[PDB]
Curated annotation (Swiss-Prot), chain A:
Protein name (record): Hemagglutinin-neuraminidase
Glycan attachment residues as annotated in the record: 218, 310, 358, 415
A GO cellular component annotation in the UniProt record: viral envelope
Ranges in the topological domain labelled Virion surface: 1-446
Gene field: HN
Listed EC numbers: 3.2.1.18
Disulfide bonds: 49-73, 63-124, 115-128, 221-338, 332-342, 408-419
Amino acid sequence: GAPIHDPDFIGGIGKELIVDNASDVTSFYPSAFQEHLNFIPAPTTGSGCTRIPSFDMSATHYCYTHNVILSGCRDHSHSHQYLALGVLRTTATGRIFFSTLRSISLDDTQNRKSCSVSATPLGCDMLCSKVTETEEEDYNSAVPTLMAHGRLGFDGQYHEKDLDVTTLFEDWVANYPGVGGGSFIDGRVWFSVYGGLKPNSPSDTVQEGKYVIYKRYNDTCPDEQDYQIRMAKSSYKPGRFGGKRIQQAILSIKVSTSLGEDPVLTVPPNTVTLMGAEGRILTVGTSHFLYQRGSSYFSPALLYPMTVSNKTATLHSPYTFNAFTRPGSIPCQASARCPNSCVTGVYTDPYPLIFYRNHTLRGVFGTMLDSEQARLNPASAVFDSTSRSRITRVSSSSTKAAYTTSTCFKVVKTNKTYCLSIAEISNTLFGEFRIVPLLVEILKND
Amino acid sequence: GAPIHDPDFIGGIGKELIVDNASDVTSFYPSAFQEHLNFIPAPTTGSGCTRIPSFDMSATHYCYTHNVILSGCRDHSHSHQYLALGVLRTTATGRIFFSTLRSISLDDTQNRKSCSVSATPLGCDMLCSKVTETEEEDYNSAVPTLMAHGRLGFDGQYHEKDLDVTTLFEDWVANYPGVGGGSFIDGRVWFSVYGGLKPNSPSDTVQEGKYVIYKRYNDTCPDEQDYQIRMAKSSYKPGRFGGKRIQQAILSIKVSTSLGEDPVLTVPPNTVTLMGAEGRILTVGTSHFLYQRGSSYFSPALLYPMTVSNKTATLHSPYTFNAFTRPGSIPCQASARCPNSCVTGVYTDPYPLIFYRNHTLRGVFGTMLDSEQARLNPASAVFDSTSRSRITRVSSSSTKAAYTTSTCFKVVKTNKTYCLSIAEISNTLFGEFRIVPLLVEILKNDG
Ligand SMILES: CO[C@@H]1O[C@H](CS[C@]2(C(=O)O)C[C@H](O)[C@@H](NC(C)=O)[C@H]([C@H](O)[C@H](O)CO)O2)[C@H](O)[C@H](O)[C@H]1O
Ligand SMILES: CC(=O)N[C@H]1[C@H]([C@H](O)[C@H](O)CO)O[C@@](O)(C(=O)O)C[C@@H]1O
Ligand SMILES: CC(=O)N[C@H]1[C@H]([C@H](O)[C@H](O)CO)OC(C(=O)O)=C[C@@H]1O
Ligand SMILES: CC(=O)N[C@H]1[C@H]([C@H](O)[C@H](O)CO)OC(C(=O)O)=C[C@@H]1O
Ligand SMILES: CC(=O)N[C@@H]1[C@@H](O)[C@H](O)[C@@H](CO)O[C@@H]1O
Ligand SMILES: CC(=O)N[C@@H]1[C@@H](O)[C@H](O)[C@@H](CO)O[C@@H]1O
Ligand SMILES: [Ca+2]
Ligand SMILES: [Ca+2]
């Protein structure tokens, strides 16, 4: 009885979209942006701050959420979340439109932040942190960040349960969802999570001495090997948050009428993962991936293959897309090639788009910020390990922007492949930002 | 079970909101704009044109729609409509939000234009014209404009039936819905319509020689009496559309599973109505009103009292709000005071807000374009027959805008009055316009 996408999409959601072994990845490219039903609310006042979009779509419905601050993006006192659950549909003319069925403003007195959502068989699951301090202050206070698992049901009602962070995140000083969407796998919902570890705690100790260096395709770091290792190690304890170890983690929760049931946190070894950061758990076909924002020295987009075993997950050496860089402050700018300590960058995920016949990933779609340091010029394109296809731009003029989260699918009825790319774009008259659901069709030269 | 607004709204939709006789209407004014769930889709491309908003809300649900053109606002080849049916709700903190339940893009082989919506017990009824020519070309072709009565049901399905315009609008050369919302009254849905009459037809001949002159509060027109009457008569047949008589009308349709059932057209005498124009049918309390856009020489916002008798309607001398002017090209600019012939102005309606104890309307809320000739600088405020309260501005800087349609309501629990004001505002990067649902609370000078 639950909602489902129109018949035109059945079988075209969350699967390997393009399988070719001959064609060059970059022979595929995005069309000009397309006009479709903008399902994302824009601000209604001059100061309203709408930011931090999260989106996930299963074979039956999609979920979306973003944060809203009344006075501006700088205010940290209180805020509310917009939540939407809907399904994909097509017009009589074959035009797609995300048709939301449940649209609500979640505003009590709790300050939910850095929320991630995931489409599960019971509706739209959301994981958020509840803050009573600034991020800097959070990392400075020994106790972990409070968190809650909530869900917007098909009936439009929202229910949630606060997680026992004192136990679940006993070894952490701060912990937040990765904002990127979560994914439903084997009866459990999986969320990317990150934060700071309590020094000398068991979690901190096991990571002691663990690091991993990922390099730029055709740009070797000149520094002596011993120095790179030194910097690689320190990259996990950047100065931004008082030298606390910023760790990557994955949280899985059983999906049931009981929210927060049987939570299990997985902390991958830092011999594979770079400094903890925002991220997303993706499922395309039978493959799973952890996207990790390039908040550290590594600029190319990362996708760590992810396999699940019961309630825990295992990550492997990541796929990297050298041309899919992100802006960052020096010495961690887009063109950075050496290990260093920093907490910068921006969330701009890559969606698995092209695969080999044997299911290894070849190319992805994404909207990068085509800039060295400043958060500017959104550019949608198709990427492989080293290059970028022809691009599609929001504007030929200098344009301020931030986060982008892309999800691709296929309209089986028209046999056309599309990619939704939700991007925070600068705005005028109504708030600092406008979260726009950009849409493009994936094309191929000839 | 059909959808319904949250309990906090029961008894706060479509009623006289403020009944006062001892206070000055302008002592009531709008608060600063409030941040709330923006239920109106903005463009997603640089050329996308989202325009022509229509909105209506009943005691159970609200309805909204707007037109979308892919290449820009000047392209008339094809387009589609965005349609939404939803209900009002409140957050845990008591914040209000319009929660849409059915959200669709309606795009087929037909080009629906100038559409109006109305919340009926069966869903969201829509009246549109289906065009295959420019407005100019339409008035030149003798046959009437094709029209259709559609409906977005609670189940999210859209159905429609073309009206037999050859018979229904036999005397017309062009006919469109007034874009403003329609209203459900006594088992029927009522829509404002306007267009041009076929010269010398029965409808045309009966209106020949008929006219009415409405004046500005103080500003008396200096022109000679006989000259004014001549200008007034001519205002009904402006040159823009070749001397055709632009006529105002009201269409009622029976609300049932059968769309377009028993349509009846009412053409009011031009001894009461000014040149035909876009409009809206409003129902507040037991009173009904026809808002008529000031497309002719009259600038002040207009609300004609409307009484219904079975399937037909009767209009009466209108309420006028002298300070609620609208921009227009000379000699029909905001400060115009004399009868004249023109087709200008813009749609910016007034919502009945304050009533006298005996139910006579005293004040309204609306968002005017505070400019003489250019469509600029939106200003939300409360108006009485002669003045305007303090205002709330979209921006202190010069701002391009267009249509505005307002609807007010109340949260009986907190006894707080709110006004939604949907306004077409200029945009950057994504299309020429952004239709924004502005929201204010109605406050009072001294309490
Ligand atoms: C220009 O100084 C600011 O003026 C503000 C006035 S209140 C208000 C207005 O003009 O009415 C409230 C409006 O809702 C608001 N508009 C929107 C869209 O949010 C409007 C604009 O913010 C203002 O006009 C700038 O364009 O302001 C208020 O006193 C501020 O505190 C002043 O700094
Ligand atoms: C928002 C938008 O529609 N962007 C479009 C842009 C802009 O119109 C121009 O860059 C002018 O700024 O033009 C494109 O050809 C491009 O650059 O990729 C297609 C793209 O869809
Ligand atoms: C929990 C929190 O504050 N998240 C913020 C995130 C964070 O600072 C980064 O992941 C480094 O920790 O950065 C930004 C941002 O535009 O970059 C916005 C998020 O609000
Ligand atoms: C049917 C039609 O074309 N409607 C148009 C309307 C019309 O020109 C006017 O009501 C004169 O009749 O004006 C305008 C306008 O922004 O002013 C936009 C509408 O799209
Ligand atoms: C799972 C598997 O067989 N992977 C291989 C990959 O190693 C190889 O590089 C590619 C061709 O070059 O084919 C497949 O993708
Ligand atoms: C129909 C009717 O009785 N209207 C009267 C109106 O004439 C008068 O100006 C006002 C103020 O007392 O009260 C009512 O509105
Ligand atoms: Ca803490
Ligand atoms: Ca015609």
